[PDB]
Structures are given as structure tokens and as C-alpha cells.
Design a binder for these strands. Structure first.
Ligand SMILES: Nc1nc2c(ncn2[C@@H]2O[C@H](COP(=O)(O)OP(=O)(O)OP(=O)(O)O)[C@@H](O)[C@H]2O)c(=O)[nH]1
Lengths: 660, 75, 82, 69, 241, 80
RNA sequence: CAGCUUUACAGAUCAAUGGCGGAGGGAGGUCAACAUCAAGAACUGUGGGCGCCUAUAGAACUUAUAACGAACAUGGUUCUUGCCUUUUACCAGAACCAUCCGGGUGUUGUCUCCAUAGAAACAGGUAAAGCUGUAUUUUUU
């Protein structure tokens, strides 16, 4: 049995599409989209995911009656006891869904509903890395917070298609009770904000990147989708795109058969408000308020939809939800939007480069895959790996490298420019992370994400697995860099086990935590005191819960929550003091420079000059890590003792790690 | 990008030598100067000359060649 | 909208076969299609009415001159139909 | 309605297979919704050149095989 | 007749809703389904008793879960109840090198408010501690002056022979719709408009008040009573029979 | 050959159809889907070509037959 | 204003094939009897492959800040407490357990109150309801 859970058997939720087809699709790249949905806390990404799952599937066991009705949200992908009981999506438990577009043709989609909360931004980062498009879901009410902006920035940095979901229209419709015009204005403002935070690409509801969602009430829609459903009967095929284009940007209808950019005096509101928002409002109000028969009649007439006799007797919110579902059909619009966003597959290469290094492509020569996050998906360890090229077969002998040993490997390769296979593992069982169930598969092809069982035990966090057949191939290959978990960790919780007897157990638990929670530095100090440097409070708490219940079940002492302090110097060093059985100076860097750092010798020198306008000699000498290390005496240019300073610099690294 | 209509317009402006190939007919070609322009590929072409293809010349006046049976244009 | 067109679109990616009015069969990975069957393929063979095969990299084909398009049997299973 | 997506084939040499078992060659300059090609002129399939710049009609096109990958 | 138009005829009857009607199952009186306006009227009537906070986030550290946590940790949220500790406080630290006042820093006072919020963190050796919630904020504005869709409490933003859908509607917001909206955000009892019948015994009108944070400037005795009530509730909740 | 007295082409979906074409070939197969412009989707298509003597046979599978090239369609057999 | 599918219609030859067919109730009772409602998120059969896979399917009810109750009592047992010093009767916590006041769902059976037809489609009309439609390069000019 288990308390933190998955399905545990082959009585899985059956799917409206057949899974064989999906599998087939997954064979060929270009017909796979890794979405990785992202947002702030409680924007409703998880809700959206759940909705999608529902749409996909026939009859799900976990979805009770209440959830079906609408009342409670089916939070599907927060399958963990914690992530349930707590209310937060805490770990990456996405899905693999064959999702259709406006063009009836269908494509498989690896969604990953990340955490919204800002202490699991490691998870978010991981998701981003995995995923090629990213749906940025936003609370309509809360709008574009700083968190959202940060997310956007991150996305921009690691090259990804940002298809926005403005979620929770319900809140503005009903909670705030904004007038339709007011709501429209708000939406516009939000869009503007988004644009501002974005570098270049202009997002609007036209072009199908903004997606208007209300994931509790159970509908997402891009204006295009809406048009397709409800402005085909009236408007002929030629001007449908044109009509769509017209809808949003401050144009009016003029009570007349063609639209006009100027404001008109007789009619009140813009086209978007008139042809979409107003309709939505009407639907809402009628659902809440109107005589049922009348509503039914309207549905029959306008939307061409019939309410069931059972569905009439529904309770209000549920009824409303049902109506919405009937109107805004099973969410294909969103999928279409996503597709539109990620019609460029030239970004993929860029993304890959960013992940690793400027790469020469070698697809047929070898299989390679970014192991992103370890997971305890179904109690047992799996590993969330994106196969980038090749195909990863079950029972394949595979070389793996933790991103810890990535830079070093690269350096070695460079130097080279005998078979040194350092570790490797056998693939036990491959599966598709389908939310609550792991639908198992034998192969795993390019440009898709999957759970693999054997890999986990090799690495600690974020690996690169590959299966070469040559020296040349090996040379060609590159190794994914360690995931920049955007939220750096400075919440220092010190541990000791309460019973020293079970220190091994504690150690094991710690290891597990490290594996699973990636945004977790675990320093095992000299004093027998383990230290966890978690991201924040809530995250830390969650980690503790996981440890002190699931991955150990041990009584454990815990300190007051401290931080990682870090030593520096205010002024420059005054005394030229040597050391014996070396004399090194000290001075702070420029604040701006430091900030830049946080976010070829000649080239380096040039960069330095650009940054702080320092001397060229200093630049030449410089060779830094983690901060800054120069070699600027007089005799060092003559001397060969000071020359060859890699070993020397290693020593310095220790100092940097553990200050005075 | 340079559209076909634009190209046609340019040709018209020029009044340079043009050599038209006929659709579903290999053995015969036309050679003249483009005078007209229409929404379709139909154009009026003064100083036209019929040419039998080398698998030389023949007499021919001023002509408008219909859009449906065009293959090649060049100028 | 045309259901055969939709089917063709869906088949995108797969190793489709393709004969013209001229009677010259092609067989290869489908790249892209449109409302009018404006097909593209990759890594494609080309056999004439005589039987002599000719390999070629990237071919585009116009729907008017296309006779019929053979898709693999996988798309019979699902899902645009119902 | 939709434009032919020939942005990959822009500024590349293409063997345009045209009506009556004929062929045209040349670098691709432009196009439109009717598939009327605009291309810099080359030889007709031993081999002989006509014209400087050429504009081919859509109906005549049987195929257009990319010479350059 | 104006305000309470619908309910008045039956409201005070032995069987609250008549027999042989379409609003209840029948004479067995086991299920009910109501129209909107009647429901609205009922809601309006019940303003004294149903006085509940529509904002769910209000109950932060007044959750059942929170109470349970407190009980476990022998840690009174000062407003809420207190119990005999689960575990006897074995004060046998023996002046160890961990959790010493030589070692730790005291910028934060680590209030017991924080204990039940992040139990597994701030509290050391937590046992039988349930996980609490961690919520979103509720911008929900209700008009008390009889007006319709108004940005009142908040501030404005900076910046072919057919018509739109639902044309010939002639009105965005129907006359009953404000009431409907109000109903929508309200809690369990009235949220719905169909239900199973509970026994008069099985309704709790006092409960809600004591679940809520107590109204301020009350006497000590009242507070004590409230606490007692909470304790009674909590224990019942905890041990499910 | 036996067949019900059908009214339209849409009403006889998934029946085993012979299909004649302008070039001379005869495509036999079950009609999966139709078009406004008479494009047919065929389930398990077999092309029968007659060179200038006897029927040369070729099995195809799932095929998208364009409407322009079709002459006419005969009902070869019922479903299943 | 065209097309096909269904009712309301004559009078048919009535084959052909379908579908409504051993064609016969409905609403309900502070009415029963039985089944079943805390388990690997968990359901039941059916054959087939051989206690387990693969297709069939079915599925009413209850459940995620986890439950039949938006509700809350009391027992019994140990252990620890407290008032206390004898016990009952008690304090308050724990762990197992039970009892109880209730709840559904399904199937029958009854009780009550209203009621009563054993055959209609085809050729197509008459009338009304469901959806589709509005020749110059890629479909049929
Ligand atoms: N009013 C309104 N509420 C919503 C909507 N979508 C979700 N919610 C509610 O607000 C919260 C957001 O839904 P969740 O899916 O839990 O949020 P989330 O995306 O998982 O957030 P993370 O846990 O950070 O990933 C839940 O309590 C939902 O009931 C919406 O469209 N409108």
C-alpha cells in the first residue's frame, strides 16, 4: 500500500484516444511537444493540467463525484500526500497527452506542471530545461507579479516558446464583478505588462499566444478557437483570419457590416468586448441567474448546444461549469495556440546549445539524453530524462555523467583535442509520466521526456546519459551543464539525528532528498552535523516532512533556521603580509560588476574592461571562480614557478569555499 | 521577396525582349514584348513572333496571349 | 473542411507514398501539407512508369498534379475520425 | 488561402519539373498563393540557357525538386 | 411582500416546504431542489446565523488541521483551544552541543504561531502532526448599497448582416443576478440549490461562530467558553467514530 | 453483387467500394471518409491496373484518393 | 429557397429490409425485506491467453484539507495523567476496540394516488422539428 501515491496497477484510466497511436507518434520528432507549464503560486497551472487530463481520458478513478460536478478542483498532478494535504504543487508530476489542434490532426504533448511557489523554483527551472514551449499561466487578479517577470526572464535565457495563459477570468467576472469593458481594460493592461517584461516578441490574443482561461470553471480559450466554434456560421471562409485579427486591438463594430478603427458614438464597446467578453459575461450571468428553460433555448439557438435533463437540476457553480464546457469545447484551442507558438523548431538547437555548448549535430551516431531530475514518482525511484537524440531502448547498457562531472569532462575533451568509460547503468523499465500512472514503454525517442528506472543510482542531480559506438562519436558529443536552479538556496537548517544509532539511515534519507529535491545543498560538516541549505521556509518544511516521514521515518533534531553567511571585505588590504610553514591581497569588486557576474584570455580582458574599466595587466593575469583571483606581481612574467597556476588555483578554491 | 505580379509590372515598365512557352504544347513558342497587365497572368504582347522549337522564324502580328495557356515568362 | 486533407496533415512525419498524373511514384517522410494538397517530402525515392528508381533529398509536390497519397496503416486506428 | 511555405527553399537552386516531361532550373527568388514561381534563369533539360530572370506559372508545375539541400 | 416575496408562504410551516411540490422529493421529504430567488431570499433572511467569512484564507491557524498540529505540539494558538500534550515533555537535553544558546542566533523569536504553520520545520521532534494549507488571497467585493457591477473599492488601470453572440439579449446583467453572484461565493449551506435533508439535530448554527476567530472586546468568560467549544469540536473531529 | 438502394454517397460510408480513375486504374477499398470535392479516404486499398490483357494487382493500404482523377464509384461489397 | 433523417397523415401491391416487440404503466409513501457501502485509489464480471497478462466491457453510492454525517454522543479494555485517597461516579490524553443517533445507493416487495395502447416505417407528397449550402492556375467547367 502507500500514503504518498500513484496508481500501482494496470487498471489505469482508459483514454479517449488509443495509447498505441500516441506511442507511434512519439516515435517521430516534430510531432512531440514538451510543454512544461509554469506560473506563480495558485495561478491554476495544475488545474489546467487536470482539465487537460480529463479531456484526454474516459473515466478516471480518482475523480470523485464532487470534482466531476465542478465543486472541488481535481488537482490531478499533485499526487503526493504532502502536495495534496498542503495544497501546493511541489514536484514535477506532468503528463503525456495526445492533444488535437484546430486542424483536427493530433500530436503527443509532454506537459510538466511545475510548482508555482517561489521556493520550489528549482522545480520550475527543471521544467523549463525539459520543456521546449512553456505555458506561463498568470492569475488575472494578481496580474504580472515580479515572480511572473522573473519566470519570463528565465524562459528568455533558456530558449523557449512562451505561450501565455491568462487564468482565472472567473475572478474578474464574478469575484471582482468588473464590468465587461473594465475587464477588457484589465486584460489589455496585463498584456502590456507581459510585453514590457518580454524583450521583443509581441503577445496578444490575436496570433494565439495569450490564452484566456478559467480552470476552476473549466474552460480555456484563445480568440481563434472561439471564432472557429462560433463565427463560422455567419462569416465566410475568406475573412475569418481577418476577423480574428480585427477582434482585439481597439476596433469597433459601428453597428454596421464592416469594422472601423475610430471610436463610434452609438455603440459602446470594442470588438473583443462585443464579440467575446460580453458573450462570456452573458453566459455567466444567465447560468447563475436566468430562468433555466430560457437559457436552454438560447444554448440551442446561439451556441447550438443542448443541456441534459440531469444537467438542468445541477447546483449553480457546477451548472455554470457544465455550460462553459458545452460552449468552449474540450480544450483544443490551448493546444492549437501552443502549436502556433512552437511552429519554430529552429529554437530547439539554440536551447540545446544553451544547455550544453555550441554543438555540432550527430544524431545517427549515438543516443543521448538529459537526465533532468530524479523522482520518486510511484514510490520507487524513476528518473525524468529527456532523450534529445537517438532512441533509448529497455535493457540498454548506457553511459551516464552527473553534471558535477560535466565541466571537468569538457576540459578533458579540450585537452585531448583509450576508452575511459567511467560509470554506466542498465535501463530497467521506461515509462511515461502520465500524472498518477506510469504507462510503461520499451523505447523512448528524440525530443521527448520519460521516466527511466535504472539511471538514478549513478548520479546525484541532473545527469547526461548516452550510448556511443565510436571514438569520433565520443569526441563529437557534449555534456549538459548543471541546471541553474534560478532560486539560489540560503535557508540553512542544521540537523542531527536524535538517535545516533541510526546515522546510516539519516545519511540515506539525506541522499534521497538530494536526489529528489534538486534545489538542496547538503553539506556534511566536520562536527557530525548535517546541514541542509534549502530554498525557503515552506520548501524546507516539505523536505523535512519527506525525510522525517517518507525517506527515513526517524526522530531528528533541527536547529533554528539560519542562513549561509558569506565573508567579504569593505576596504582594500593595507598590510603586505606573507605566509610560511605566499602573500595575497584583498579588495572588493565593483557592485555592478558583481551583479553582472551573478547573472580566451584577450576576450576575458576585453570583457573586464567593458565591465569596470580596469587595467589591462590585471585582466591578463585574472583567472576566477565561484570570487576573483589575479596573479599580478613583478617577477611572475620572468618566473616559471608562478607559471602553471591551475594547481595553485585549486588551493584558492578551498579558501573560497571555507573562509576565515 | 519579389512577387510574380511585381515582376510582371517591372517587365512591363522595361519593355524588354520576352520569350513565352505554351502550355501542353512543346513544339511552338512565342517571342515578343509585354505591353499589358491583368489580375491573372493574361497580358497583351505587341511585336510577337512565333518560333518552332529545335527538337529560324515565322510571321506573326500583335497578340494578346491568354493567361490559362502560359508556361514561361522572362525579361 | 476536407477530411482527406486532414488525414494527410495528420500523416505528417510518416513514410507516405505519392503517385502523380504522370505516373511517377514517390515514397518518403512527409514534411508539410496545406488545404490544397501541397505536399513536401524528405529522403525520398522516385520511380517512373518504366521502373527505374531515382533517389532525391527534398521534393515539393502540387496537389493538382498528385493522383493519390498512400499513408501507413497506423492512422486507420485514430483519431481525427471519431 | 494559405501561402505556400517555401521559405526553406528561398535563394536555393531548384529543379522545377514542369508539364509535358519538361524541366527548368534556377535559384529561387519569390512566390505567391497561386504557386507562380519567380526564379533566376538557367538551362532547360545536352543543355542550353534562356533568359536572365524567369517567372513560372503555377498550373504548369508538376514538381520542384531541391538541388541544394 | 417586496423583499421576502417567495419564501413567506411556506417559510413557517411544520414541513418547511409543502408536500406534493416540485421543490422537494415529496412527502418523504428526503431531497430538495430550489429555484434561485427563493434561495436568495433565504440567504438574506439568514444573515444573522450564517454570518460566515466567504474568504477561505481567513481560517489561517484556525483549521482543524492546525488545531490538531497544536494539540500534537502542545502549542496553543492563543485564540484557539489547548489540550493535554500527546507526549510527555522529556526534558533530557543534557546541555548538548545542539540547540544550545552558545550556538544559535535569536533574530527571530520563533513564535508558536509559526510552529503550527510549518510544523516539520520550526518544531523539532514533531509527532502525529498533520500538514496544513497555504493559500491564495480573496478579492471578492459585494455591493451593500443596491448597485450593479462597479469598480468601487479598487483603482482603475493606467491606460456582413450579423451581430455578436447572444444578440437580442438586450441586457447583460439580469435583475436576479446580483443575488445569484452573492450566493455563488457564499459557503456550503447556500452555495448550492439542491440538497439532501439533514435532521434538525444534524444542523449546527452555533458551530460556525465558535469555529471563527472570536469577535474582539468580549469578556474573558465568553472567550473561555469559545475555547471550550472549539476543544469539544476538535476532539470530535479528531477521533472519527 | 448485392447492395441496398442508397440515396447519397455519405449514407454508404464504410462499404467496400470499387473506384474507377481517368488513367485506367481501378482502386478497390472501404470508404473511410469523403469530401466536398469528392476526395476519398480508402481503408485497405488495392489498385487494379489493366495494361494493353489481364488485371495486374497492387496492394496499398490506407490511401487518400483525389477527386479530380476519379471517374466513378461502384459498390463492390458491404461492410466488415 | 434546395438535401437527408424523424414524428403528425391518407389509401395503397405490400415483398424487401430495418428498427419499438415475447410488445401492458407512471408518480410517489417520515413503508418494508435483502445486498452493499474504508480498500493495493482501492470496483465488478466475460471469455480468451494460459494464480496472473490481452481484449471486452461495464460502474449505482461514497471520498482528498480525505470520507457513508459538511453531524457528533456513550461505552469496554490497557498505559499514562488529575481531583484524590476506598469504590463507583469522575479529570484528560493515548492506543486499540465496540455501542449507539443517523445516512445513503442498488434490487425486490409491498401501500397510496392517477391512468389503459398491441403494432407503426416503404413509392414519394402535405406539415413540423434536427444539421449543411450560398465557370478565368490546386479538385466540378
Ligand atoms: N476563481 C478561480 N479559482 C481557481 C481557478 N482555477 C483554480 N482556482 C482555485 O485556486 C487555486 C488554484 O488552483 P491550483 O491548481 O491548486 O493551483 P496550482 O496551479 O496548483 O498552483 P501551484 O500549486 O503553485 O502549482 C485552487 O484553490 C483552485 O480551487 C479559476 O479559474 N478561478
Amino acid at each position: 500500500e502507500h500514503t504518498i501515491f500513484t496508481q500501482l496497477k494496470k487498471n489505469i484510466p482508459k483514454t479517449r484516444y488509443n495509447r498505441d497511436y500516441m506511442l507511434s507518434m512519439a516515435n517521430i520528432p516534430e510531432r512531440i511537444i514538451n510543454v512544461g507549464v509554469i506560473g506563480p503560486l495558485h495561478s491554476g497551472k495544475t488545474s489546467l493540467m487536470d482539465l487537460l487530463v480529463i479531456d484526454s481520458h474516459k473515466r478516471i478513478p480518482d475523480m470523485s463525484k464532487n470534482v466531476e460536478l465542478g465543486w472541488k478542483p481535481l488537482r490531478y498532478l499533485d499526487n503526493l500526500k504532502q502536495e495534496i494535504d498542503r495544497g501546493l504543487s511541489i514536484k514535477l508530476n506532468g503528463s503525456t497527452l495526445l492533444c488535437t489542434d484546430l486542424e483536427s490532426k493530433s500530436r503527443m504533448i509532454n506537459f510538466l506542471d511545475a510548482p508555482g511557489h517561489v521556493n520550489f523554483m528549482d522545480e520550475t527551472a527543471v521544467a523549463l530545461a525539459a520543456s521546449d514551449l512553456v505555458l506561463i499561466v498568470i492569475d488575472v487578479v494578481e496580474g504580472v507579479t515580479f515572480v511572473v517577470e522573473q519566470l519570463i526572464k528565465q524562459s528568455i535565457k533558456n530558449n523557449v516558446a512562451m505561450c501565455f495563459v491568462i487564468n482565472k477570468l472567473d475572478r474578474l467576472i464574478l469575484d471582482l464583478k468588473l464590468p465587461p469593458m473594465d475587464a477588457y481594460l484589465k486584460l489589455n493592461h496585463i498584456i502590456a505588462n507581459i510585453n514590457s517584461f518580454t524583450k521583443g516578441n509581441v503577445f496578444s490574443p490575436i496570433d494565439n499566444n495569450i490564452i484566456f482561461a478559467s480552470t476552476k470553471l473549466g474552460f480555456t480559450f484563445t480568440i481563434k478557437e472561439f471564432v472557429s466554434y462560433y463565427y463560422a456560421h455567419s462569416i465566410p471562409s475568406s475573412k475569418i483570419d481577418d476577423f480574428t485579427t480585427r477582434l482585439w486591438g481597439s476596433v469597433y463594430y459601428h453597428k454596421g457590416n464592416f469594422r472601423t478603427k475610430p471610436f463610434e458614438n452609438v455603440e459602446k464597446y470594442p470588438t473583443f468586448v462585443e464579440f467575446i467578453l460580453i458573450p462570456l459575461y452573458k453566459i455567466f450571468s444567465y447560468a447563475l441567474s436566468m430562468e433555466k428553460d430560457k437559457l436552454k433555448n438560447l444554448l440551442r439557438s446561439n451556441f447550438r448546444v443542448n443541456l441534459s435533463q440531469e444537467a438542468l437540476q445541477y447546483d449553480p457553480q457546477p451548472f455554470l461549469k457544465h455550460v462553459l464546457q458545452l460552449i468552449f469545447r474540450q480544450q483544443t484551442g490551448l493546444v492549437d495556440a501552443i502549436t502556433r507558438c512552437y511552429q519554430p523548431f529552429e529554437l530547439f538547437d539554440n536551447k540545446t546549445a544553451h544547455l550544453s555548448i555550441p554543438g555540432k549535430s550527430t544524431p545517427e551516431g549515438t543516443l543521448w539524453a538529459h537526465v533532468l531530475k530524479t523522482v520518486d514518482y510511484g514510490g520507487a525511484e524513476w528518473s525524468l530524462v529527456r532523450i534529445y537524440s537517438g532512441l533509448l531502448k529497455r535493457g540498454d547498457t548506457v553511459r551516464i555523467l552527473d553534471t558535477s562531472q560535466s565541466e571537468s569532462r569538457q576540459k578533458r575533451q579540450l585537452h585531448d583535442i583509450e576508452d575511459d568509460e567511467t560509470p554506466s547503468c542498465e535501463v530497467e523499465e521506461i515509462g511515461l509520466l502520465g500524472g498518477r500512472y506510469v504507462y510503461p514503454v520499451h523505447e523512448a525517442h528524440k525530443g521527448q521526456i520519460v521516466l527511466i528506472k535504472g539511471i538514478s543510482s549513478a548520479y546525484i542531480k541532473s545527469a547526461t546519459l548516452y550510448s556511443v559506438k565510436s571514438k569520433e562519436d565520443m569526441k563529437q558529443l557534449k555534456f549538459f551543464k548543471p541546471l541553474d536552479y534560478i532560486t539560489e538556496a540560503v535557508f540553512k537548517i542544521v540537523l542531527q539525528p536524535l538517535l545516533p544509532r541510526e546515522l546510516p539511515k539519516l545519511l540515506d534519507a539525506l541522499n534521497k532528498i538530494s536526489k529528489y529535491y534538486p534545489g538542496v545543498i547538503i553539506k556534511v560538516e566536520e562536527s557530525g552535523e548535517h546541514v541542509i541549505l534549502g530554498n525557503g521556509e515552506l520548501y524546507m518544511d516539505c523536505l523535512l516532512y519527506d525525510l522525517r516521514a517518507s525517506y527515513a521515518k526517524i526522530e531528528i533534531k533541527i536547529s533554528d533556521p539560519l542562513t549561509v553567511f558569506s565573508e567579504s571585505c569593505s576596504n582594500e588590504s593595507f598590510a603586505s603580509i606573507p605566509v610560511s610553514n605566499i602573500s595575497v591581497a584583498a579588495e572588493p569588486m565593483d557592485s555592478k560588476m558583481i551583479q553582472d557576474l551573478s547573472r580566451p584570455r584577450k576576450l576575458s580582458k576585453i570583457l573586464r574592461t567593458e565591465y569596470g574599466w580596469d587595467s589591462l595587466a590585471s585582466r591578463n593575469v585574472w583567472s576566477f571562480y565561484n570570487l576573483i583571483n589575479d596573479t599580478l606581481p613583478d617577477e611572475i612574467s620572468p618566473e616559471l614557478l608562478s607559471k602553471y597556476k591551475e594547481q595553485i588555483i585549486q588551493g584558492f578554491y578551498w579558501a573560497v569555499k571555507e573562509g576565515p | 521577396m519579389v512577387p510574380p505580379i511585381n515582376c510582371i509590372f517591372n517587365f512591363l515598365q522595361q519593355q524588354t525582349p520576352v520569350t513565352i512557352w505554351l502550355f501542353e504544347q512543346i513544339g511552338i513558342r512565342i517571342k515578343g514584348k509585354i505591353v499589358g497587365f491583368d489580375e491573372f497572368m493574361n497580358v497583351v504582347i505587341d511585336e510577337a513572333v512565333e518560333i518552332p522549337v529545335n527538337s529560324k522564324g515565322t510571321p506573326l502580328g500583335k497578340i494578346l496571349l491568354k493567361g490559362d495557356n502560359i508556361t514561361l515568362i522572362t525579361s | 473542411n476536407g477530411i482527406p486533407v486532414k488525414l494527410l496533415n495528420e500523416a505528417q512525419g510518416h513514410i507516405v507514398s505519392l503517385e502523380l498524373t504522370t505516373g511517377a511514384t514517390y515514397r518518403g517522410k512527409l514534411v508539410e501539407s496545406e488545404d490544397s494538397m501541397n505536399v513536401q517530402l524528405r529522403d525520398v525515392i522516385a520511380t517512373e512508369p518504366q521502373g527505374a528508381v531515382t533517389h532525391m533529398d527534398q521534393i515539393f509536390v502540387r496537389g493538382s498534379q498528385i493522383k493519390f497519397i498512400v499513408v501507413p496503416d497506423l492512422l486507420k486506428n485514430a483519431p481525427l475520425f471519431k | 488561402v494559405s501561402t505556400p511555405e517555401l521559405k526553406k527553399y528561398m535563394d536555393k537552386k531548384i529543379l522545377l519539373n514542369i508539364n509535358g516531361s519538361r524541366k527548368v532550373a534556377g535559384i529561387l527568388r519569390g512566390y505567391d498563393i497561386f504557386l507562380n514561381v519567380v526564379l533566376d534563369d538557367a538551362m532547360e533539360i545536352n543543355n542550353h540557357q534562356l533568359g536572365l530572370q524567369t517567372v513560372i506559372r503555377g498550373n504548369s508545375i508538376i514538381s520542384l525538386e531541391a538541388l541544394d539541400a | 411582500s417586496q423583499d421576502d416575496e417567495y419564501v413567506k408562504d411556506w417559510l413557517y410551516d411544520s414541513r418547511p416546504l409543502e408536500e406534493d411540490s416540485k421543490k422537494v422529493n415529496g412527502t418523504s421529504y428526503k431531497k430538495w431542489s430550489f429555484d434561485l430567488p427563493e434561495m436568495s431570499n433565504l440567504y438574506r433572511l439568514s444573515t444573522p446565523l450564517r454570518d460566515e467569512v466567504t474568504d477561505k484564507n481567513y481560517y489561517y491557524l484556525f483549521d482543524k488541521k492546525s488545531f490538531f498540529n497544536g494539540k500534537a505540539l502542545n502549542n496553543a494558538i492563543p485564540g484557539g483551544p489547548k489540550f493535554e500534550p500527546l507526549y510527555p515533555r522529556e526534558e533530557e537535553e543534557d546541555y548538548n552541543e545542539f540547540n544550545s544558546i552558545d550556538r544559535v542566533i535569536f533574530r527571530v523569536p520563533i513564535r508558536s504561531e509559526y510552529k503550527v504553520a510549518f510544523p516539520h520545520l520550526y518544531n523539532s521532534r514533531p509527532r502525529s502532526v498533520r500538514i496544513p494549507w497555504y493559500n491564495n488571497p480573496v478579492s471578492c467585493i459585494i455591493q451593500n448599497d443596491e448597485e450593479y457591477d462597479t469598480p468601487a473599492l479598487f483603482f482603475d488601470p493606467s491606460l456582413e448582416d450579423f451581430a455578436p453572440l447572444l444578440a437580442e439579449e438586450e441586457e447583460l446583467i439580469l435583475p436576479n443576478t446580483k443575488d445569484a453572484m452573492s450566493l455563488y461565493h457564499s459557503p456550503f449551506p447556500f452555495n448550492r440549490t439542491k440538497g439532501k435533508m439533514v435532521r434538525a439535530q444534524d444542523v449546527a448554527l452555533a458551530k460556525k461562530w465558535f469555529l471563527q476567530h472570536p469577535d474582539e472586546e468580549y469578556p474573558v468568560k465568553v472567550k473561555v467558553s469559545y475555547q471550550k467549544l472549539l476543544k469539544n469540536y476538535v476532539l470530535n473531529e479528531l477521533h472519527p467514530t | 453483387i448485392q447492395v441496398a438502394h442508397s440515396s447519397r454517397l455519405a449514407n454508404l460510408i464504410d462499404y467496400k467500394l470499387r473506384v474507377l480513375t481517368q488513367d485506367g486504374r481501378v482502386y478497390i477499398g472501404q470508404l473511410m471518409a469523403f469530401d466536398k470535392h469528392m476526395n476519398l479516404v480508402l481503408n485497405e486499398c488495392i489498385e487494379e491496373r489493366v495494361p494493353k490483357i489481364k488485371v495486374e494487382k497492387r496492394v496499398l493500404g490506407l490511401t487518400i484518393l483525389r477527386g479530380e482523377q476519379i471517374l466513378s464509384t461502384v459498390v463492390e461489397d458491404k461492410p466488415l
